[PDB]
């Protein structure tokens, strides 16, 4: 948890989130349900698609081994060929193993960052009209119906519209 979102203040994943990596859950008088964030998921798909494609192209021109025959009087020459092919394979094995380990750390941390950005995007948009419960959820001080929830999901919350109603409930 480099960014503290996955396994951090959001301690559990969602099994009902089936149409995207990341998204929202809401619950009001009308009902409740999940909704994947397609835009953030698509951007994540772009990095992983390019990250793997870049991996293939780099080791595209890896060293290739060719069999050779040497007589019993060419022990030194045969040893050179043996140590060259073994040495090159050891170098390329290290590079392939290291790249996978380094990218796995990068990929898991990249996925961690996107939730923190998504969590902060909603928080900075509902500045004062909600409570920050600290477990990844926000509690509204006003009535937020499906049209209001959908505005929060697509980044079009009308803070001045609910500014007056929220503060009356917040104060008392």
């Amino acid at each position, epitope marked *: 948890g480099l960014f503290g979102a996955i396994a951090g203040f959001i301690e559990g994943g969602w099994q009902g989130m*089936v*149409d*995207g990596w990341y998204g929202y859950h809401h619950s009001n008088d009308q009902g409740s349900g999940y909704a994947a964030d*397609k835009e953030s*998921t*698509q951007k994540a*798909f772009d990095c*992983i*698609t390019n990250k*793997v*494609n870049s991996v*293939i192209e780099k080791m595209n021109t890896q060293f290739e081994a060719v069999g050779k025959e040497f007589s019993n009087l060419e022990r030194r020459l045969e040893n050179l060929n043996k140590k060259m092919e073994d040495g090159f394979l050891d170098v390329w094995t290290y590079n392939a193993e290291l790249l996978v380990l380094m990218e796995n750390e990068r990929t898991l941390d990249f996925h961690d960052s996107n939730v923190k950005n998504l969590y902060d995007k909603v928080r900075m948009q509902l500045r004062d009209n909600v409570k920050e419960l600290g477990n990844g959820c926000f509690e509204f001080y006003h009535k937020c119906d499906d049209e209001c929830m959908n505005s929060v999901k697509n980044g079009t919350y009308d803070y001045p519209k609910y500014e007056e109603e929220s503060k009356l409930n917040r104060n008392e």
Partner: antibody
Amino acid sequence: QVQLVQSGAEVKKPGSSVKVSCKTSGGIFRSNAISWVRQAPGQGLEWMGGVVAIFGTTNYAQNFQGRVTITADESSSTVYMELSRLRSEDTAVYYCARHSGYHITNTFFDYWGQGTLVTV
Amino acid sequence: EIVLTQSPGTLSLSPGDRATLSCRASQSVPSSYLAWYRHKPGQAPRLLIYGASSRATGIPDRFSGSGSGTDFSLTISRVEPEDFAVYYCQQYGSSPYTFGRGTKLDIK
């Protein structure tokens, strides 16, 4: 450089099923949603259904609900379509279309398959 | 379910004539999600225009289109010998993903 390869032409009889495949190249794993669009000769193109890239969620048109089953295997990056209970006027050319994104919604068909002709 | 009505139907032209194809929608297409495809018989359809205002990659400059609401159009300033096929318009802003009637272009 992305191409979609489908199965061959098939002949069937009413009451049987069809299994049309569509394998996509250009990457290790499929990252774009694939849908199925058919064109009956003398009629226009119709949308049958599609499958999301990684999560495998499937959406079907109300006309073909209960008769079409679209499945994909992540290992082989192939998409299969299974149309059951064949009847008259099910003769058409089936294309597999690749969406511009990972999801069916709000995405257009970047590329199309060459097409398979199925007769009942 | 948005039904798309393509008006011209048949449009016989010669290389050089301006080609204007009109696609009409029963209800407004959200976010102007409409695309145009070229489907020569015996070949897989190819994407010409997506979003009603953006050209697809590799498409020659002569292909362009514009529109909004329920009215969309495709314009080909200069017709070439390879511009004779059936042109469809789809809307991808609604769940059913309906398709257009299609218009074949003939040789005069």
